[PDB]
Design a protein around this ligand. Structure first.
Ligand SMILES: O[C@H]1[C@H]2[C@H](O)CCCN2C[C@H]1O
Ligand SMILES: [Ca+2]
Length: 736
């Protein structure tokens, strides 16, 4: 039963700086793999390491890059060639075409047209097997590139082996950071050379220099295959060698099979039927993208116990560690998805977070590998609390709570996105002022508020002191401090307490991050009713939502000076100011449920799923962002979305398929039957849950886990009476 056939790793690779259609590369990897491998079309150092329209491949690279914007670390490449032994990354490059390329999560193949060589790779979590099919030539070589900024290489002929380490990175690493790699060939070298800053040196065994490389070679018969076993570690050569054992004695075929099995095992936890081939492809591609980040950053020791290099303090320590995710993106639904279908995995991740705190002093917000300065918010709180509240509990709860509290009153000395920048003002005034030299104050305030709700939630659960509990309950209401009654919008506010003037609701950035007031105003995940109230009741609230879609996509970019890609992405979709291409607004359509008009959510949700996602190389409508934008589709296609992580609630949308089945780790299954689904029939007329009638606009975690059947009768006309009753509404803090 194979779902991998639907996965297109090229989806999102046809992106450019001006317009993102995903900004992804073909991550050939195991789920959450420590090391990813990709064909490399971009020049060394370029965030866009693989682009669909590129003509040439210049290497097969080990990568850890989460985003072109964030860039890479622990990176080196290998490239087979023929003819002259050349190290230069342009001269070694080869034309190829996509019709001569086969990309799957577990297997990658391509024909290098200028060398007449076929390259195949199959990876494990930490290692990979390459098989090079050479033409007949007296001069066949393999180039190993350690990249620049200080690297090391060494050839061991008596073991047909090349070892080295690479260090080029993009920040967020300890001074001693290194990636140690080992490469074993099954064919003896007739030619060997190391490379030292572009210089080829035959028979010099070893280089320690800015940019080390190696070239080995031999005579090849037509069709002769040479295999290279490769692995790496962030710990040591000894450890890299241990990692190499993941390959066993397997060949390309056997490893591919194991990787396929591995992926089907996770993709198969969600079976969908009764859709068209585009939908299958969009859906599983998205699911695959949701099982990559954060990556494992731990390695197995002699006793099979997890240990890790600390990207926070550079020691090697026992226990789990993961990295390469930005919580500002992924708290929204990516991690919620893990808690629903892959809690065993998130348990490891959560334990990793505890270690991050122990080793770093803070919980991370953006980590690649270590703390990096990107985005805003203290959403690690949502990640941590949502997990706990959903049954994924770390062993050290004392430490968890302390960590949470620590982050409310500290900001990292060098990485301002770690901890709460502006906490002094926030704690004192109730908001982060628009005029105190802290940017994106309004976005910070709104998210901090939701964060504090999460802390309140956990604190209550821990039966902490009333004074504590009350303090966060109070701070959860801070979003009110930025609400402008006249505009009905969230708005920047001065320290002196006056709202900021001139006010441009359509201006991006400044008070907000990559969105304007019309996008950020909806960021009250824990208290939609509270928001509804400030706007003057649900009717006015719905009017307000509706105009998001109804107005042209006009904008003010003065804060950026140029039409950044996320603005352009909005303009072209012709859906008003609904910028689905970016994270802040992604939950918004579901808010219709809270105002007693679920049918409007049903209508627009189906719009988005039909129009904003296609299965091709230009498949997404904005940055994919480490699973967030993909998992949005995954949830939404199933029919529900975790608007407010930290509750046990998935707010109801509309299911895309005629049947979906979930297999939870607990052994139960849940079937969602929508036999009458169609392109036309995207309204929910009625719903029953194991035979009971279900008029609510949400489902509960514990209920889903019990399994059974949900029936959804789809219709082509909205049902104006379902889900308008007050007990149908999802959670709002104000109602508590
Ligand atoms: O997604 C936000 C953030 C990502 O978290 C990391 C890449 C750069 N940024 C783009 C923003 O939209
Ligand atoms: Ca983004």
């Amino acid at each position: 039963k194979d779902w991998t056939q639907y996965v297109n790793p090229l989806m999102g690779s046809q992106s450019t700086f001006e317009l993102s259609t995903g900004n992804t590369y073909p991550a050939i990897a195991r789920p959450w793999g420590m090391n990813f491998w990709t064909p490399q079309t971009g020049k060394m150092g370029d965030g866009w390491q693989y682009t669909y329209t590129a003509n040439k491949i210049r290497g097969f690279k080990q990568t850890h890059q989460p985003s072109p914007w964030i860039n890479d670390y622990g990176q080196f490449s290998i490239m087979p060639i023929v003819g002259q032994p050349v190290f230069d990354e342009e001269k070694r490059a080869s034309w190829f075409a996509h019709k001569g390329e086969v990309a799957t999560p577990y297997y990658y193949k391509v024909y290098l047209a200028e060398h007449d060589i076929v390259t195949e790779m199959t990876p494990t979590e930490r290692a990979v097997l390459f098989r090079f099919t050479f033409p007949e030539n007296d001069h066949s070589y393999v180039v190993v590139d350690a990249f620049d900024k200080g690297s090391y290489i060494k050839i061991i002929p008596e073991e047909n082996k090349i070892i080295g380490y690479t260090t080029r990175n993009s920040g967020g690493v300890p001074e001693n950071f290194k990636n140690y790699f080992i490469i074993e060939f099954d064919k003896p070298f007739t030619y060997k050379a190391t490379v030292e800053n572009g210089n080829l040196q035959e028979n010099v065994a070893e280089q320690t220099t800015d940019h080390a490389g190696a070239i080995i070679g031999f005579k090849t018969r037509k069709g002769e295959q040479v295999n290279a076993r490769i692995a790496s570690s962030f710990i040591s050569f000894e450890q890299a060698a241990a990692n190499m054992n993941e390959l066993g004695k397997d060949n390309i075929e056997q490893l591919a099979q194991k990787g396929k099995d591995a992926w089907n095992q996770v993709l198969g936890k969600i079976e969908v039927e009764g859709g068209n081939l585009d939908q299958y492809r969009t859906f599983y591609s998205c699911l695959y993208r949701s099982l990559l980040f954060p990556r494992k950053f731990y390695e197995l020791d002699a006793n099979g116990q997890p240990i890790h290099y600390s990207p926070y303090n550079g020691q090697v320590l026992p226990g789990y560690m993961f990295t390469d995710t930005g919580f500002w993106d992924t708290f929204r639904c990516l991690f919620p998805l893990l808690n629903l279908m892959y809690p065993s995995v998130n348990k490891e991740m959560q334990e990793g977070l505890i270690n991050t705190y122990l080793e770093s002093g803070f919980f991370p917000e953006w980590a690649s590998p270590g703390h990096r300065g990107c985005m805003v918010g203290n959403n690690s709180a949502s990640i941590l609390v949502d997990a706990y509240m959903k049954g994924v509990k770390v062993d050290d709860i004392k430490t968890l709570y302390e960590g949470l509290i620590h982050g409310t009153e500290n900001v990292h000395p060098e990485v301002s996105s770690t901890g709460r920048l502006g906490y002094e003002y926030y704690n004192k005034l109730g908001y982060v002022p628009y005029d105190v030299k802290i940017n994106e104050n309004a976005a910070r305030t709104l998210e901090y508020a939701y964060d504090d709700w999460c802390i309140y939630r956990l604190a209550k659960e821990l039966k902490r002191p009333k004074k504590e509990i009350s303090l966060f309950a109070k701070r959860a209401m801070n979003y009110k401090n930025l609400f402008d009654k006249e505009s009905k919008l969230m708005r920047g506010r001065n320290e002196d307490g006056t709202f900021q003037s001139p006010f441009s609701p359509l201006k991006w950035g400044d008070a907000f991050t990559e969105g304007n007031s019309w996008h950020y105003t909806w960021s009250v995940f824990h208290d939609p009713q509270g928001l509804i109230d400030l706007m003057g009741g649900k009717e006015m609230f719905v009017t307000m939502m509706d105009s998001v879609f109804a107005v042209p996509p006009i904008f003010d970019d003065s804060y950026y000076g140029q039409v950044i890609h996320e603005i352009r992405e909005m303009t072209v979709m012709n859906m008003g100011n609904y910028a689905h291409g970016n994270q802040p607004i992604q939950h918004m359509i579901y808010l219709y449920d809270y105002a007693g008009q679920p049918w409007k959510a049903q209508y627009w949700l189906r719009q988005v799923m039909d129009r904003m996602y296609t299965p091709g190389p230009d498949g997404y409508c904005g940055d994919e962002d480490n699973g967030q934008t993909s998992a949005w589709y995954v949830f939404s296609a199933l029919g529900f979305y975790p608007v407010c992580p930290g509750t046990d609630e998935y707010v109801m949308g509309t299911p895309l398929f005629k049947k979906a089945t979930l297999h939870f780790e607990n052994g139960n299954s849940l079937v969602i039957d929508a036999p009458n689904n169609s392109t036309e029939n995207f309204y929910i007329d009625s719903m029953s849950f194991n035979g009971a009638d279900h008029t609510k606009n949400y489902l509960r975690h514990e209920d889903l886990f019990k399994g059974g059947t949900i029936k959804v009768d789809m219709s082509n006309r909205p049902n104006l009476n379902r889900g308008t009753k007050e007990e149908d509404m999802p959670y709002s803090f104000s109602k508590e």
